[PDB]
Amino acid sequence: MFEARLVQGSILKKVLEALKDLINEACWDISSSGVNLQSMDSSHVSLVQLTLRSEGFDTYRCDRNLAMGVNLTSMSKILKCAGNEDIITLRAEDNADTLALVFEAPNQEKVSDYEMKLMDLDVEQLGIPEQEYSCVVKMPSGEFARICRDLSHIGDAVVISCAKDGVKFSASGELGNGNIKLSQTSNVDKEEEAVTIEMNEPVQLTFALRYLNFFTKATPLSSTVTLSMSADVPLVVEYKIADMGHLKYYLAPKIED
């Protein structure tokens, strides 16, 4: 018997939008420590991991661990019937091939009850060696998404390069070429819309912008985003879900060596 309520159900809406276009089915692992999701897209180029921990919820309860397999498009369609002010409760029996989503207006006598049919999944967790990255660029989220969307119009691939003083995104195509140079905010120390870099090692790598512009569906979740990069390893784009945990997109580089 699983029950999770959020007074601020906006977050659930945002997650599903951040996900629905990159992946279409995924298995939501529920346990008493909270909610966990790891699924790959159709071309196994990108991987997403979602952690919402139990303490973030206003009400959490998980008698027996669950792996519920969820059509994410179905789920987003339902979640678009919730208001941003709505209080959202998730409920599912031990077995039950169904998930209930309940949405209540804080401040009106309106209550919505949706029963989402689940699906038989069984994915198989990949394992994510946890490690140190040559570069970690923390910047504003709107900005990263502006950069990804603009350079799309130049080319199909972006080359991201990092040293101690800033990062640069480059791209090429029929049109021409272009480079955007972002520099470490020297204001910093206690600033909000900054750019800060943990370079240990110059990196320079190359990713498809298609997947990057899927990741920036996550923008509404946090004012700020981080890119972790190292020589021969997928890139991590991370959005912190204030007070609950995080969404991490992982992306396999383009390479010829």
Binding site: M40, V45, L47, L126, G127, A157, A208, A252, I255, E256
Partner: peptide, 16 residues
């Protein structure tokens, strides 16, 4: 062009 796209599986493997 300039390269080719790796998969996420070439880097992350089934859970020990």
């Amino acid at each position: 062009s300039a390269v080719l796209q790796k998969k996420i599986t070439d880097y992350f493997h089934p859970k020990k």
